[PDB]
Nucleic acid binder design. Structure first.
Ligand code: DUP
Ligand code: CA
Ligand code: CA
Ligand code: CA
Ligand code: CA
Ligand code: CA
Length: 901
DNA sequence: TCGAGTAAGCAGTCCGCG
DNA sequence: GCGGACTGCTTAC
């Protein structure tokens, strides 16, 4: 078995490494690693080492890591570049694992934990840790066991042992419904006192030391709480046993508004699942409580209990412990679906970094590029300081606000990475500059050809064509990986639609789901068997197909994120290869590419229609164009189509056989114009959209840039069983829009696009009539809440106080004096409701922590005084008015001459 | 919100606009 | 009442 690292740290002049040896055993070692760094040397001196620009370097081998660090400092004192990898543990990993790492996840100890702390006087601050830890559940991936540490005796109450038999039974039996599949995996340990609990936990931790440590808010709460509580009870040395090297650091995390403290445990890789979720999920959620996210991801019900959490252990210890266990399991269930741990491991081992560095694309790419260069005996440049400077981005076309009946969209494959590769954009491939014409002149192909020697971008930059830069070389590798996983994702998606179709005609039989790989398009044999299956089996297959789609989505979209972040890093001052010339080369080329192909598509369609000067491209943003297909449909005549699927087939074939070849020709000419290294502008059909055949639906509409809705029948080769709304930017897509209002606005849009004006009118009339019955949470707005203190002047709104902050200040006055009441936390999200004039809260709105019921003391008053009229006008009527005016229709029936009959 | 980038939309404050 | 200048927040890419 090939060896692989688990964790690596630098502690003074030593590297401390945990690793899996060639026999599959976990080991630890301390290595007196002697790092090398580099200085430029005379061309006369014979070396094998060259910088990225081809300048020769001499290697300097240091007696230890502190000597190397001191040398860097002195080189700055002299004013000379100190070249090489200054993060010595990355150099250590590069030397020690000089091959593509194959890791075995079954040997990696992944721990998932959660603690409970009863607190009568508000939130238990981890820096203080003044309250007993009364429960820990710690799941270990190697053992596949939930270890439960339960405090029976506390100053806040003495309790009886938790019962696994009660835990297992249904809620209807008085049980806790702990999932049957984990019941046999629970190892329950009760304790007579907190000191014994914590000592045993540390002994357990020593035996089963996490490599990856995760859970929900573990970095901000659980870890600092446990560390500080042990520190308070036993002293520092004992608390440091949470580190396998007995080293910890209090780390100050800073933002624009303030700072917070976390505990760095040397030799452990903390991947807090909340942070993995925020980075890798591509959602923006109204709440990030585990109950909220679990309900969203898994469709599990919120865990119900009577009274406040501060009294739960005393009143119902049985439920208290069961809920602690379930909380740990829910994170495991979310990871089973989303697979963010798998992603982090893949990425981390690929780059040869500490696994926790997957949060930083700058660190990830620094390591990838370093390792790549090192293989050629090339030497990385020193990082330099740069002032933050703005630079230009993508082009977005201003659409004419209107309905658009038939629409075909086209999109460039992985645009910015493709530009990097096509143009050959890299720190070491810069060849020089040329005199720039206005962008318009390049778009229309009237400007002089930039170069007959080098590969060009319309920002004035020229690049070598003789060899690929390291940035193109390395970005291509990850792009190719992304392509494979996107293939699996789309196959799974297409497979899901086959099952959805079959579910229209389920067979009356007792069946089992088919044992199949959803990552590959179903064979004819599989399709024939699916048509014979029961609804139970089909639904189970659909669930499995959709789970496979999600797995593929995680793998593909986050590889996309990584490569797009390499582009972004070029425009971040902390990146070793920061260069606004290269960042701007990419974006400016993109602006040209979009507008160039806009022209070419307009030219092609005008030719085939026999018309002159009309605009077929109605919209474009960054790398995509939207083409009006009305005239193409009208050339055949709607009466000649059998059904909706018939004109969809026709447009699909037209896009693939006619437009794509023309688009390809257009881009090949642009490549020659810019003298680029390799043609990689691949623009393929994305969406086919329109109303159902024979209906009064409008098909689609735009209100402005980044704000549109389309009724889509086929998306990237997936032919839907039922049409899918593609809605971008509109209020249905915003986390700030109330839940029930998103739902209502979506139905309004559906009716507009699929059914027409009259259908829209009847739904509006009903919503307006009934909406006051909707649950208050479902009609509350949502907002992040920053700078509460800034706008707080004696408990009242200061100058220019934002609406949501005003609401928080109102809440704060209403709960004043109560240490029990939930506090609004700076930087988190709040629900917001408007209040009718003359209300007892003394202001026009109130806000409270999102994902929660408002506290009982003020709930009745909030409900009594909620301003339904303002709520409706602001969240529903205003956006709907926007949609309908753009689409040129009315949400309320206009008076007619027929009324007088 | 510690963690790659820019474009650009809407809500709301403040206050001009005879 | 609406718009511009501005802050705040959130989305598309
Ligand atoms: O998070 C992002 C998204 C997009 N972009 C830029 C780069 C990207 O190539 C371009 C187009 O984004 P898309 O969302 O269309 N995806 P892309 O073309 O990169 O990939 P895909 O192949 O999926 O379309 O906009 C970013 O820089 N960061
Ligand atoms: Ca694209
Ligand atoms: Ca694409
Ligand atoms: Ca059937
Ligand atoms: Ca796109
Ligand atoms: Ca193609």
């Amino acid at each position: 078995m090939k060896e692989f690292y688990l964790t690596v740290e630098q502690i003074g002049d030593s590297i401390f490494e945990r690793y899996i040896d060639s026999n599959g055993r976990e080991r630890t070692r301390e290595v007196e690693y002697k790092p090398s760094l580099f200085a430029h040397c005379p061309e006369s001196q014979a070396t094998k080492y060259f910088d990225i620009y081809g300048k020769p370097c001499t290697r300097k081998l240091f007696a230890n890591m502190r000597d190397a660090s001191q040398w860097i400092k002195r080189m700055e004192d002299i004013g000379l570049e100190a070249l090489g990898m200054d993060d010595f543990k990355l150099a250590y990993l590069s030397d020690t694992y000089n091959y593509e790492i194959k890791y075995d996840h079954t040997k990696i100890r992944v721990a998932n934990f959660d603690i409970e702390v009863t607190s009568p006087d508000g939130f238990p601050e981890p820096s203080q840790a003044k309250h007993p830890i009364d429960a820990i559940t710690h799941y270990d991936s190697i053992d596949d066991r939930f270890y439960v540490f339960d405090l029976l005796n506390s100053p806040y109450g003495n309790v009886e042992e938790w019962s696994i038999e009660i835990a297992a039974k249904l809620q209807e039996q008085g049980g806790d419904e702990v999932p049957s599949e984990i019941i046999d995996k629970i190892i329950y340990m009760p304790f007579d006192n907190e000191k014994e609990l914590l000592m045993e936990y540390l002994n357990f931790w020593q035996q089963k030391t996490p490599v990856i440590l995760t859970g929900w808010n573990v970095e901000s709460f659980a870890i600092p709480y446990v560390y500080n509580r042990i520190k308070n009870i036993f002293g520092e040395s004992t608390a440091k046993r949470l580190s396998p090297h007995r080293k910890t650091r209090v780390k100050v995390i800073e933002n624009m508004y303030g700072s917070r403290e976390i505990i760095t445990l040397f030799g452990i890789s903390v991947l807090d699942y909340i942070d993995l979720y925020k980075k890798f999920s591509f959602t923006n959620q109204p709440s990030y409580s585990l109950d909220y996210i679990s309900e969203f991801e898994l469709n599990v019900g919120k865990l119900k209990y009577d009274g406040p959490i501060s009294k739960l252990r005393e009143s119902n210890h049985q439920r208290y412990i069961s809920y602690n266990i379930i909380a740990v399991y829910r994170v495991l269930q979310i990871d089973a679906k989303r697979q963010f741990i798998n992603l982090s491991l893949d990425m981390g081992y690929y780059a040869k970094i500490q696994i926790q560095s997957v949060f930083s694309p700058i660190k990830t790419w620094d390591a990838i590029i370093f390792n790549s260069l090192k293989e050629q005996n090339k030497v990385i440049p020193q990082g330099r300081s740069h002032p933050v400077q703005p630079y230009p981005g993508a082009f977005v076309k201003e659409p004419i606000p209107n309905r658009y009946k038939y629409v075909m969209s086209f999109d460039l494959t992985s645009l910015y990475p493709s530009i990097i590769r096509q143009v050959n954009i890299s720190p070491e491939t810069i060849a020089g500059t040329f005199k720039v014409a206005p962008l318009h002149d390049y778009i229309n192909a009237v400007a002089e050809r930039p170069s007959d020697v080098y590969s060009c971008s319309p920002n004035g930059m020229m690049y070598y064509k003789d060899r690929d830069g390291v940035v193109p070389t390395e970005i291509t590798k990850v792009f190719n990986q992304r392509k494979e996983h996107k293939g699996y994702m789309l196959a799974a998606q297409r497979n899901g639609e086959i099952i959805k179709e079959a579910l229209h005609n389920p067979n009356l039989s007792v069946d089992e789901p088919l044992d199949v790989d959803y990552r590959f398009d179903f064979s004819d044999e599989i399709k024939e068997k699916i048509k014979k299956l029961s609804a139970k089996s089909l639904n189970e297959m659909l669930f499995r197909a959709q789970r496979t789609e999600v797995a593929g989505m995680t793998a593909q979209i986050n590889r996309k994120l990584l490569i797009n972040s390499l582009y972004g890093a070029l425009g971040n001052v902390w990146f070793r290869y920061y260069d606004l010339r290269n960042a701007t080369a990419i974006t400016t080329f993109g602006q040209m590419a979009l507008q160039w192909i806009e022209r070419k598509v307009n030219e092609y369609l005008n030719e085939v229609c026999g018309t002159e000067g009309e605009a077929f491209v109605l919209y474009g943003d960054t790398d995509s164009i939207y083409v009006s297909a009305d005239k193409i449909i009208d050339k055949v005549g709607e009466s000649k189509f059998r059904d909706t699927n018939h004109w969809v087939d026709f447009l699909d074939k037209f896009a693939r056989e006619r437009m794509e070849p023309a688009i390809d020709r257009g881009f090949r000419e642009m490549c020659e114009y810019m003298n680029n290294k390799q043609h990689l502008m691949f623009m393929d059909r994305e969406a086919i959209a329109g109303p159902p055949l024979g209906s009064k639906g409008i098909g689609g509409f735009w209100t402005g840039k980044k704000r549109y809705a389309l009724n889509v029948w086929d998306m990237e080769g997936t032919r839907y069983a039922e049409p899918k709304l593609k809605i971008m930017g509109l209020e249905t897509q915003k986390s700030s829009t109330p839940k029930a209002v998103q739902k209502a606005l979506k139905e309004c849009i559906r009716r507009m696009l699929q059914e027409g004006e009259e259908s829209l009118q009847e739904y509006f009339k009903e919503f307006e009539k009934e909406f006051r019955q909707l649950n208050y949470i479902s009609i509350a707005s949502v907002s992040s809440a920053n700078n509460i203190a800034k706008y707080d002047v004696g408990g009242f709104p200061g100058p220019k106080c934002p609406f949501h902050i005003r609401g928080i200040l109102t809440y704060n006055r209403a709960i004043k004096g109560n240490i029990d009441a939930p506090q609004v936390v700076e930087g988190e999200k709040v629900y917001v409701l408007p209040l009718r004039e003359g209300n007892p809260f003394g202001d026009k709105c109130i806000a409270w922590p999102s994902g929660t019921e408002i506290t009982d003391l003020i709930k009745d008053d909030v409900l009594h005084w909620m301003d339904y009229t303002v709520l409706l006008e602001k969240t529903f009527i205003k956006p709907l008015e926007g949609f309908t005016s753009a689409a040129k229709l009315d949400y309320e029936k206009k008076a007619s001459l027929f009324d007088m009959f």
